């Protein structure tokens, strides 16, 4: 299917102010270590004033913080979700299925991803590296997509609709009961991974 509209809107929703991509990659790499991230740690990595870190994050409405005010979630998160995302000996989580496909390339590490089919509850898993997917179980695994909204919180408008399914026919049956969602579409996990690759290429091309 044609994926340009999805790539365009996700980039628009993710890149709200200059420096967002510059901040996002280092942040994901820090979160993948499995501990909360302080704004001063980010400031030092980037060579920015901590105020500026704060300004970028403030536009990032969905950002999750802990009781200490440290960052614990921005796409990749320490707070439990339906999408388990493990890097070596650290268990992390992700906000949605497409996230699990995108982050390995940005972090530079291979992740073991696991979840359950949104329609049937069957366990699903795969291994996602920066360049390819492997051990897709079951082999016909699928993903749902919707068109992201520009002036909405990304979790409410996109992430909550983007799931894994046991198969394409199972996903399509599920989708038949989900009208009024702009751009709702079912793709194989392979097609979704390719969408992630194209998104990443465009995102990285906007960094320093």
Catalytic residues: 96, 99, 159
Which of 4, 151 has the CB closer to Br ion?
Answer: 4
Pairwise CA distance, residues 62 & 68, whole Å:
17
Q: Which of 5, 108 has the CB closer to Br ion? A: 5
Contacts of 67 (CB under 8 A, 6+ apart): none
Nearer to Br ion, 2 or 67 (CB): 2
Q: Which is nearer to Br ion, 1 or 160 (CB)?
A: 1
Burial class (CB in 10 A: 0-12, 13-18, 19+), 59: exposed
One of 1, 2, 113, 201 touching Br ion (CB under 5 A): 2
Interface segment toward Br ion; rule CB under 5 A; list 4-12, 144-152, 154-162, 184-192: 4-12
Contact range with Br ion by CB under 5 A, out of 2-10, 57-65, 83-91, 171-179: 2-10
Instruction: Report in angstroms how near the CB of residue 114 gets to Br ion at its nearest.
Output: 32
Nearest approach, Cβ of residue 26 and Br ion (Å): 32
| Residue 177 binds to Br ion (criterion: CB under 5 A) | no
Q: Does 4 bind Br ion (CB under 5 A)?
A: yes
Q: Minimal distance in Å, beta carbon 84 to Br ion?
A: 33
Cβ 2 to Br ion shortest distance, Å: 4
Binding site for Br ion (CB under 5 A): 2, 4
């Amino acid at each position: 299917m044609k994926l340009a509209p999805y790539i365009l809107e996700l980039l628009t929703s993710v890149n709200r102010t200059n420096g967002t991509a510059d901040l996002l990659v280092p942040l994901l790499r820090e979160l993948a270590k499995g501990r909360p991230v302080s704004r001063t740690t980010l400031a030092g990595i980037l060579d920015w004033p901590a105020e500026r870190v704060a300004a970028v994050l403030e536009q990032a409405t969905s950002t999750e913080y802990d009781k200490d005010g440290n960052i614990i979630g921005y796409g990749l998160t320490l707070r439990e979700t339906s999408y388990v995302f493990e890097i070596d000996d650290r268990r992390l989580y992700a906000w949605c299925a497409l996230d699990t496909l995108i982050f390995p390339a940005l972090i530079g590490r291979t992740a073991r991803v696991s979840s359950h089919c949104a329609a049937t509850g069957a366990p699903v898993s795969l291994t996602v590296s920066p360049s390819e997917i492997q051990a897709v179980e079951p082999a016909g695994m699928a993903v749902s997509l919707v068109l992201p909204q520009e002036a909405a919180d990304v979790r409410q408008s996109f992430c909550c609709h983007v799931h894994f399914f046991a198969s394409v026919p199972t996903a399509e049956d599920w989708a038949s009961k989900h009208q009024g969602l702009e751009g709702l579409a079912i793709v194989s996990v392979h097609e979704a991974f390719g969408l992630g690759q194209e998104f990443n290429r465009h995102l990285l091309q906007t960094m320093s």
